[PDB]
Amino acid sequence: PLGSILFRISYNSEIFTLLVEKVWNFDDLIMAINSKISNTHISPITKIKYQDEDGDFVVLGSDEDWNVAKEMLAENNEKFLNIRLY
């Protein structure tokens, strides 16, 4: 049952979880992480690399990449997600 998705912000040596709805386009999305990571409010990120079913990381900076992945979650049977922050 689809509803919400979780994001596992994976940094260099930092790890955080952010609950991102399935209605938060790439905009609100980028703003969602940019909000949580806002903690530093020194220099956020504009590029997020999310994992795919194949298990290969892929860039994500649009809805076509934020959705194309979502539709995959169902195929991955994962209500969560993994993002890369470098």
Swiss-Prot record:
Residue ranges of domain PB1 in the record: 4-86
Further remarks about this protein from its record: Present with 1010 molecules/cell in log phase SD medium.
Reported function: Promotes the exchange of CDC42-bound GDP by GTP. Controls the polarity of calmodulin, and the calcium regulatory process of bud emergence. CDC24 may be involved in the initial selection and organization of the budding site.
Assembly with partners or alone: Interacts with AXL2.
Name recorded for this polypeptide: Cell division control protein 24
Species this protein is from: Saccharomyces cerevisiae (strain ATCC 204508 / S288c) (Baker's yeast)
The gene coding this protein: CDC24
Parent-protein start and end of this portion: 761 to 854 of 854
